[PDB]
Design a binder for this molecule. Sequence first.
Ligand SMILES: *[C@@H]1O[C@H](CO[C@@H]2O[C@@H](C)[C@@H](O)[C@@H](O)[C@@H]2O)[C@@H](O[C@@H]2O[C@H](CO)[C@@H](O)[C@H](O)[C@H]2NC(C)=O)[C@H](O)[C@H]1NC(C)=O
Ligand SMILES: *[C@@H]1O[C@H](CO[C@@H]2O[C@@H](C)[C@@H](O)[C@@H](O)[C@@H]2O)[C@@H](O[C@@H]2O[C@H](CO)[C@@H](O)[C@H](O)[C@H]2NC(C)=O)[C@H](O)[C@H]1NC(C)=O
Ligand SMILES: COc1cc2c(cc1OC)C(=O)[C@H](CC1CCN(Cc3ccccc3)CC1)C2
Ligand SMILES: COc1cc2c(cc1OC)C(=O)[C@H](CC1CCN(Cc3ccccc3)CC1)C2
Lengths: 527, 527
Amino acid sequence: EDAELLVTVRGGRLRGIRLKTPGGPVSAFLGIPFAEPPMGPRRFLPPEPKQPWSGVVDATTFQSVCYQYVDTLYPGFEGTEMWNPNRELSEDCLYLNVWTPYPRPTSPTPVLVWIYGGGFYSGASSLDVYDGRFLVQAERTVLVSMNYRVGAFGFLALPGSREAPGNVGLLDQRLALQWVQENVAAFGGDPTSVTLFGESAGAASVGMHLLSPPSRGLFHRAVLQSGAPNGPWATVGMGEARRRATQLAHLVGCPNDTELVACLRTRPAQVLVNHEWHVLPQESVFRFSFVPVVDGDFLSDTPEALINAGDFHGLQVLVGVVKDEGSYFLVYGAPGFSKDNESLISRAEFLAGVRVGVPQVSDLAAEAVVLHYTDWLHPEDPARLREALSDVVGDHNVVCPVAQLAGRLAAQGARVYAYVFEHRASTLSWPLWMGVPHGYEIEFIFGIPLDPSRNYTAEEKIFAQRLMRYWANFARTGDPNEPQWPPYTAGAQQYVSLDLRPLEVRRGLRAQACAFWNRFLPKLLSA
Amino acid sequence: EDAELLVTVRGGRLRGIRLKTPGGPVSAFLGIPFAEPPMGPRRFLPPEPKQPWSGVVDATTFQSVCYQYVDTLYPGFEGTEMWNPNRELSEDCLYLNVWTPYPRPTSPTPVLVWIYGGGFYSGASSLDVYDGRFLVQAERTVLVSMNYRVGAFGFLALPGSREAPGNVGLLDQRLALQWVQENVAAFGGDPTSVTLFGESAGAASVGMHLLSPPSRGLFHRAVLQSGAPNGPWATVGMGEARRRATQLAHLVGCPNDTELVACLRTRPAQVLVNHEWHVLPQESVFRFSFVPVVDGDFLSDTPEALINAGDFHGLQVLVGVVKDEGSYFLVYGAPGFSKDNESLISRAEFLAGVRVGVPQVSDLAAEAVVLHYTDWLHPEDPARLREALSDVVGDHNVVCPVAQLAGRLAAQGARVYAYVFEHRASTLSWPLWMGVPHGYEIEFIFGIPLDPSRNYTAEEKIFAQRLMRYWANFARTGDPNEPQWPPYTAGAQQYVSLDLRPLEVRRGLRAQACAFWNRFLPKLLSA
Ligand SMILES: *[C@@H]1O[C@H](CO[C@@H]2O[C@@H](C)[C@@H](O)[C@@H](O)[C@@H]2O)[C@@H](O[C@@H]2O[C@H](CO)[C@@H](O)[C@H](O)[C@H]2NC(C)=O)[C@H](O)[C@H]1NC(C)=O
Ligand SMILES: *[C@@H]1O[C@H](CO[C@@H]2O[C@@H](C)[C@@H](O)[C@@H](O)[C@@H]2O)[C@@H](O[C@@H]2O[C@H](CO)[C@@H](O)[C@H](O)[C@H]2NC(C)=O)[C@H](O)[C@H]1NC(C)=O
Ligand SMILES: COc1cc2c(cc1OC)C(=O)[C@H](CC1CCN(Cc3ccccc3)CC1)C2
Ligand SMILES: COc1cc2c(cc1OC)C(=O)[C@H](CC1CCN(Cc3ccccc3)CC1)C2
């Protein structure tokens, strides 16, 4: 046997596997249990630490994916399938993965912890696009990724109840981070240099750990890609969480909070998934039924309030967005959109699309959106309308929540670096009109282009290596730099473009659009 | 005696004067009485037709200027003095002026009728800049201009009362127009071709005659320069007119409508003028105490409603603005502004200036203004802030009311031509930062540069001749064209730039800005 692939952690012994990479081997420990399986009476409850085991746990393959909806929108299309579960679904799903250089580092090595996105309703650490093998070999880090509960299993909340307190998926993440603190040294990782990074709901997760004191001691630096805890999709208030939980019970034949959860616990996991989208109150894109709930516990206040009131001295954070954050979402409900035509919508479809992209706001707020995003010299031009609705959804859900987070953190003591990712992958299957869509920077950060079996270009490989170096520099030092990448500040608002050309420094994260969403529109909604 | 200078009109015989002009002689009949002097018991009352006289009235000089405030902001500065009364003040002021070619035309000639601006509180037909001799000689038109009551004497209203019904200044204008119908043929003018033109409050007056049926039979075309009847300064509601009238009475020692007006009729004219500005409810620029009142009589409803509900087929209209409608107004009250420095204001002064320029709106509405007019990449640049406040005032008071009117008229049957006047006069006394300010296209339309005694460049003389041709072409044919000047439409929104260069066609009268003022902001104020 190979001693490099045998590790003893606090709970017992593990057997890993040696993996090939174009640059040399790496060691991988996949499917390490970090919590007791949250099944049966355990459903909806906070995770409990995994009890010690005798013998050797086989950490040689990815474990199951947490129960979740499977996207049926374009069956067999690789653009949607790459995000779907690639292992069987199970509620017995709380496992994490460690990648380390081969042979294992003997001196403490900086740790990256990946939190996957997927709207808090989907995702898995086993997806191909999250393969940590390239980052670990090229940049000599330890990489950890964990599965955490999603959808009703992670975030159904009956606030006040002990049975379904909400946010347990976030506690799954915290438990994995405590696991890293306690065991990552056994794999050569340095528990004193832990950088959290995540995308979309994973980024929103990272931010929530920044704003929750019990988690803030489990890591040192943060990377938020295309997501933020203050996103209008990332949290729900207590009353709407209760209504969504109560409607879900009703749709599956249930029924006292205790009595309601007890009946929910009797239902097959798949039954809850089958009705998940039906508890959304209005037609929408970029909205998800079961998300973190602001209840005073995990989050003592709203993320916006917590951001505006925080001392962030000593924090370095790396944030950014893709060029077209909104386009991807339009084909899941905006009238007139399809990946298979050019989606050259009419003004009437644009107007209807605005209510789908900004659901549950006053007619006055919707008019304000139409005012800002209409070119009144070309009010009915279909191409401009398509781009404008994509900007509405992208600005409102991603860019402007990210800009607000970065502005407040910088103005309150944190060093912030900002990027816009502007390269469209040669391999992208989605239509050209979607531009650079949500999620398609991840494969470059993880160095997937280095995989020879895939058909990336030679400068795409160099680009991936640049990005891995930036990300790993930030993990090691708080500074992505080795043309220079300057910090983002509330005044100068500098960020860099990431593409095949050299770094170009630019100003303003859609500053005009984000003044509307971050400064004016809240005032309108309060009055 | 000279027969060219003798004319008989319905009220009796008139003697005029022969005027010299760089291009040839013109006949002028200045100071023709068209109403009984509205003095004593007649103050605040509708005008009464001039009773016929025996003998010959000498119409040889301008009559007195209607009682009015005199601008004291920069004493002896020609930029302010040129607008101040150049004849003694009197309530005995209801006289009009006719200019005709010498010798008198042999065939019926098109008539231009000028209505001066001055915020409805000031102005006079005698000002040097309204000298009709050049238009008449260059373009062989008949030109008429009238005095009409201003300030409290023209527009103090106690709505419902017979003693101060309001709008008598507009009835002064209407009576003069009836005089033109009955008498202009005696000067060679064609009463079937009468074109109204006016600037600022005169433009708004022209517009109100378009929307008042009794006036509509007295003219055929209209020209609105830098003003519109739907401007937020040009009308007041019944209750606010009553409150201003009542506060004016209170401030001059007056306690029943008839008893109140009777007490006011005893006060010296100058005493009413001395208190005129004190009835404005809030600190402001571009607001005037006594303006046309929406009463159900002269205006069946608000100008905005009448515009939106009217059939305008068969109407030709020429409308336009200067490049910098707002700058002039800032030195009358916006903090940090002066003609004598560069008025490089701070953000704090800008914010304060926005409430002065947009008085009596909700805090939320003010925030919406700040959002649209702040460049959030340069929120504090003094030069940009100065230009932004000027655009706020120019867009809100002039450009966007003119654009709304032009768009509605075109879409409802009228042929519309639109211009932006972009030439800054060589002789201009105001600082360079004001650009092309409110009012400074008038001297070119009237051909004042052809006066040799003045020091205009030769190119300005050519330019004035071009502009007179456009105006007279429109007056004769409804079409300024002889590069072509296309009609303005709600869709294409085409207009021409007027300066020393040839006609350049452009699109949108500040369209992004005016969507905010005309489409969104009203919805906000009602909610
Ligand atoms: C672009 O596609 C949308 C969606 O239609 C789907 O994709 C097309 C490629 C084609 O295969 C359609 O039949 C598919 O349904 C079109 O909008 C749809 O129009 C139909 C009827 O005309 C309607 O029943 C759907 O609800 C519409 N989908 C909406 C509103 O989201 C759209 O018209 C296409 N654009 C074109 C053809 O120019
Ligand atoms: C630009 O001028 C304004 C107006 O001030 C007047 O004109 C100046 C040329 C100078 O002679 C001033 O003293 C005049 O009062 C300045 O704003 C004024 O500032 C003073 C304080 O110094 C204050 O008492 C006034 O109320 C201000 N007036 C207004 C209308 O706000 C302004 O500071 C000057 N800007 C410069 C010099 O950059
Ligand atoms: C089935 O019903 C619905 C399903 C969805 C929506 C609305 C729905 O109806 C309201 C959405 O808005 C979602 C659209 C996202 C699906 C996942 N992808 C790929 C991706 C996954 C993870 C990270 C980054 C990208 C992005 C768009 C799904
Ligand atoms: C004394 O108080 C005030 C006086 C004025 C304002 C506010 C005031 O206090 C709030 C204004 O806003 C007015 C500013 C105009 C004065 C006349 N001119 C010249 C002109 C005359 C006729 C047509 C076109 C231009 C333009 C600016 C006057």
